[PDB]
Design a protein around this ligand. Sequence first.
Ligand SMILES: [Mg+2]
Ligand SMILES: [Mg+2]
Lengths: 69, 69
Amino acid sequence: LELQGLGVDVYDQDVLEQGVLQQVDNAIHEASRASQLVDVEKEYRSVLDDLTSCTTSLRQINKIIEQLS
Amino acid sequence: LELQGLGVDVYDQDVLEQGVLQQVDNAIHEASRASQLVDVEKEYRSVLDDLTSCTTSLRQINKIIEQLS
Ligand SMILES: [Mg+2]
Ligand SMILES: [Mg+2]
């Protein structure tokens, strides 16, 4: 008698028994992970652009100073 | 007769049948993911420190200029 299945936490994947509910679960969890990753990429990019902007300024500054040579 | 199990790709998790091999698989895959994440955090941090260093320089520069007021 399948009873040890009742022992699993409700919100555990293993509780889903085959077909459409597994399909929906896969979709919503995979979309959430994909969403997290887009957010990290955006956050990294925003910092990378800022570092690029700050750097090129220094190059411009140092050139202006070095132009006085 | 369990035969549709032979149809799975060899390097798929589902091929591992219970116990110690599943235990080893979990360990090596989880360690690999944890390793990737440490690397991303290090890479982001290195950029964040660089942006911090570039920024504080500009603050120092602008102060020196503004000191002439
Ligand atoms: Mg779920
Ligand atoms: Mg494996």
